[PDB]
Design a protein around this motif. Structure first.
Motif, short mmCIF file in Angstrom:
data_model
loop_
_atom_site.label_atom_id
_atom_site.label_comp_id
_atom_site.label_asym_id
_atom_site.label_seq_id
_atom_site.Cartn_x
_atom_site.Cartn_y
_atom_site.Cartn_z
N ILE A 1 0.89 -1.31 -0.01
CA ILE A 1 -0.13 -0.08 -0.05
C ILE A 1 0.89 1.11 -0.14
CG2 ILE A 1 -1.74 1.42 1.32
CD1 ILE A 1 -2.58 -1.39 2.60
N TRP A 2 1.05 1.84 -1.02
CA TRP A 2 1.51 3.33 -0.99
C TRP A 2 0.38 4.29 -0.96
CZ3 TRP A 2 2.31 -0.30 -4.75
CH2 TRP A 2 3.63 -0.89 -4.92
N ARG A 3 0.87 5.67 -0.49
CA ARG A 3 0.01 6.64 -0.53
C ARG A 3 0.49 7.68 -1.21
NH1 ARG A 3 -0.62 10.83 4.83
NH2 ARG A 3 1.56 10.81 4.26
N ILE A 4 -0.49 8.50 -2.07
CA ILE A 4 -0.41 9.71 -2.89
C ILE A 4 0.21 10.81 -2.09
CG2 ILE A 4 -1.32 11.32 -4.48
CD1 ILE A 4 -2.16 7.78 -4.47
N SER B 1 3.22 14.31 -6.20
CA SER B 1 3.12 13.61 -7.42
C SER B 1 3.68 12.09 -7.58
CB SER B 1 3.57 14.25 -8.85
OG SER B 1 5.12 14.66 -8.32
N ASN B 2 4.09 11.50 -6.41
CA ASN B 2 4.67 10.32 -5.96
C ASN B 2 3.76 9.69 -5.29
OD1 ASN B 2 7.82 10.34 -6.90
ND2 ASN B 2 7.55 12.44 -6.19
N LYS B 3 4.13 8.05 -5.13
CA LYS B 3 3.50 7.25 -4.38
C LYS B 3 4.60 6.85 -3.19
CE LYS B 3 4.21 3.02 -6.91
NZ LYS B 3 5.51 3.47 -7.87
N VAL B 4 4.09 6.87 -2.18
CA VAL B 4 5.10 6.91 -0.93
C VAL B 4 4.56 5.64 0.05
CG1 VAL B 4 6.13 7.97 1.07
CG2 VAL B 4 5.55 9.25 -0.66
N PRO B 5 5.38 4.74 0.25
CA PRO B 5 4.99 3.64 0.96
C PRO B 5 4.51 3.79 2.31
CG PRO B 5 7.22 3.37 0.20
CD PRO B 5 7.00 4.72 -0.22
N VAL B 6 3.38 3.20 2.67
CA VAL B 6 2.80 3.22 4.03
C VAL B 6 3.29 2.51 5.01
CG1 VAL B 6 0.34 2.85 5.19
CG2 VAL B 6 0.54 4.10 2.97
N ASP B 7 3.53 2.77 6.22
CA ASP B 7 4.18 2.10 7.28
C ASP B 7 3.30 0.62 7.20
OD1 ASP B 7 4.95 2.90 10.65
OD2 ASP B 7 4.84 0.76 9.65
N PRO B 8 4.05 -0.45 6.82
CA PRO B 8 3.39 -1.68 6.82
C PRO B 8 2.74 -2.26 8.17
CG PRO B 8 5.61 -1.95 5.94
CD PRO B 8 5.70 -0.54 6.70
N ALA B 9 3.24 -1.73 9.24
CA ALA B 9 2.58 -1.80 10.49
C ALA B 9 1.15 -1.08 10.63
CB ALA B 9 3.56 -1.41 11.61
N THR B 10 0.91 -0.33 9.68
CA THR B 10 -0.26 0.46 9.77
C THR B 10 -1.52 0.04 8.47
OG1 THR B 10 0.45 2.49 8.46
CG2 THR B 10 0.76 2.39 10.83
N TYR B 11 -1.01 -0.64 7.87
CA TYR B 11 -1.83 -1.16 6.68
C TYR B 11 -3.26 -1.53 7.28
CZ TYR B 11 2.02 -2.01 3.06
OH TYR B 11 2.82 -1.93 2.34
N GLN C 1 -3.29 -10.17 -9.97
CA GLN C 1 -2.91 -9.08 -9.42
C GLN C 1 -4.06 -8.22 -9.52
OE1 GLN C 1 1.86 -8.32 -9.60
NE2 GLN C 1 0.76 -7.95 -11.43
N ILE C 2 -4.25 -7.57 -8.42
CA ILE C 2 -5.16 -6.44 -8.39
C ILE C 2 -4.63 -5.00 -7.80
CG2 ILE C 2 -7.50 -5.56 -7.48
CD1 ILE C 2 -8.21 -8.53 -6.72
N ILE C 3 -4.93 -4.07 -8.54
CA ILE C 3 -4.52 -2.69 -8.24
C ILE C 3 -5.88 -2.35 -7.80
CG2 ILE C 3 -3.83 -0.45 -8.71
CD1 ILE C 3 -1.76 -1.93 -10.55
N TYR C 4 -6.07 -1.79 -6.41
CA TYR C 4 -7.17 -1.07 -5.85
C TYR C 4 -6.68 0.35 -5.83
CZ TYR C 4 -9.91 -5.06 -4.61
OH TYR C 4 -10.66 -6.23 -4.70
N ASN C 5 -7.38 1.29 -6.37
CA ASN C 5 -7.11 2.79 -6.17
C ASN C 5 -8.32 3.64 -5.45
OD1 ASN C 5 -5.71 2.51 -9.22
ND2 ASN C 5 -5.40 4.55 -8.06
N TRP C 6 -7.65 3.65 -3.97
CA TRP C 6 -8.64 3.95 -3.07
C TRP C 6 -8.53 5.48 -2.76
CZ3 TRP C 6 -8.77 6.24 1.70
CH2 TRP C 6 -9.99 6.12 2.52
N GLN C 7 -9.69 5.99 -3.07
CA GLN C 7 -9.83 7.81 -2.98
C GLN C 7 -10.45 7.98 -1.73
OE1 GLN C 7 -11.63 9.70 -6.04
NE2 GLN C 7 -12.31 11.28 -4.78
N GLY C 8 -9.69 8.93 -0.85
CA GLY C 8 -10.30 9.22 0.49
C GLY C 8 -11.42 10.40 0.12
N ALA C 9 -12.41 10.49 1.18
CA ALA C 9 -13.51 11.32 0.88
C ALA C 9 -13.15 12.88 0.70
CB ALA C 9 -14.63 11.07 2.26
#
Ligand SMILES: [Ca+2]
Ligand SMILES: [Ca+2]
Ligand SMILES: [Ca+2]
Length: 321
Positions: free
Chosen positions: A11-14, A17-27, A50-58
């Motif tokens: 899981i990366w976070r936008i 203009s980059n994706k940045v890895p999310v603390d794997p402890a917090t997935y 393989q699935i890419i989920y593109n999750w958009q926050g409210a």
């Protein structure tokens, strides 16, 4: 998707203009103000997928949205165009996505990052609304820590600097209570368990004083005919009524149309600021018709919604419009 959701995932976070890895402890924990990309590797029925989920926050801004589009396109190509793509907005996650976190609930925090302000800090007192759907998928959404924000149908978590509380609505489910406990485990606080109606003084005090909140007979009801939201419009050239699936979100209320919220023992007619008179008139006819083919029809205006209406939404915001 029969896959059990236990495959390897990144899981990366936008951020910019980059994706940045999310603390794997917090997935499993996401900022509602941010957009995410989830690369999910699995193997099911003998085949690897393989699935890419593109999750958009409210609360994700339009530029964060634009950035994830490029970012996904890159990732897709990097993987030689093999994976399955799925765009998902907060509150409309499919079952399979919800399962990726080991039975844990999805926790959505107020705030997030941006280019200007960077990472926002968490508030010292904070309230979470923990709601699970029919199927047991559970969401703990952070909201404003005011007494008014509670609703009898869910479990809430309250975390002050000096104390924690697990408030359980008359209508909350075991899933919602389990979810609350998991959030508390992530928050690293020990709860005081509170049932609705016998709250201690410290609890009301921590929310800035006791007040009325989102309650109704139906909201209180433990047994559960889950409520149904419909969009009523005449923008296409004729009046139409279509249902809105998934979690009931404030974004689902079209500010230029009328909405019907059927809580079974009551029908709510929500009028958009920018709706036309005809849209409401027709909606009143249609509601009256729904009912007569098997009850108070309450008419509510954008920005003047009663607690009995708002409670049905996962995480309201007074300053949304
Ligand atoms: Ca953001
Ligand atoms: Ca509930
Ligand atoms: Ca309209």
């Amino acid at each position: 998707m029969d896959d059990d959701g236990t495959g390897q995932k990144q899981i990366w976070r936008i951020e910019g203009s980059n994706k940045v890895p999310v603390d794997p402890a917090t997935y499993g924990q996401f900022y509602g103000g941010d957009s995410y990309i989830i690369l999910y590797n699995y193997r099911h029925g003998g085949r690897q997928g393989q699935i890419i989920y593109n999750w958009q926050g409210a609360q994700s801004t339009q530029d964060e949205v634009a950035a994830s589009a490029i970012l996904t396109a890159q990732l897709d190509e990097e993987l030689g165009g093999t994976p399955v793509q799925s765009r998902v907005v907060q509150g409309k996650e499919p079952a399979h996505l919800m399962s990726l976190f080991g039975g844990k609930p999805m926790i959505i925090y107020k705030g997030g990052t941006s280019r200007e302000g960077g990472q926002t800090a968490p508030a010292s007192t904070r309230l979470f609304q923990v709601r699970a759907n029919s199927a047991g998928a559970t969401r703990a959404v952070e909201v404003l820590p005011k007494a008014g924000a509670l609703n009898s149908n869910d479990a809430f978590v309250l975390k002050t600097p000096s104390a924690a509380y697990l408030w359980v609505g008359t209508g909350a489910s075991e899933a919602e209570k389990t979810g609350a406990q998991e959030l508390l485990r992530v928050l690293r606080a020990q709860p005081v368990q509170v049932a609705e109606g016998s709250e201690p003084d410290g609890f009301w005090e921590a929310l800035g004083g006791k007040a009325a909140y989102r309650t109704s007979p139906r909201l209180k009801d433990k047994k559960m005919h889950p409520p149904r939201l419909f969009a009523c419009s005449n923008k296409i050239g004729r009046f139409v009524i279509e249902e809105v699936p998934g979690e009931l979100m404030q974004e689902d209320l079209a500010t230029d149309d009328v909405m019907l919220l059927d809580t079974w023992d009551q029908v709510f007619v929500w009028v958009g600021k920018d709706s036309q008179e005809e849209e409401k008139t027709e909606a009143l006819t249609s509601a009256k018709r729904y009912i007569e083919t098997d009850t108070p029809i309450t008419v509510v205006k954008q920005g003047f919604e009663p607690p009995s209406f708002v409670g049905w939404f996962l995480g309201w915001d007074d300053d949304y419009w």
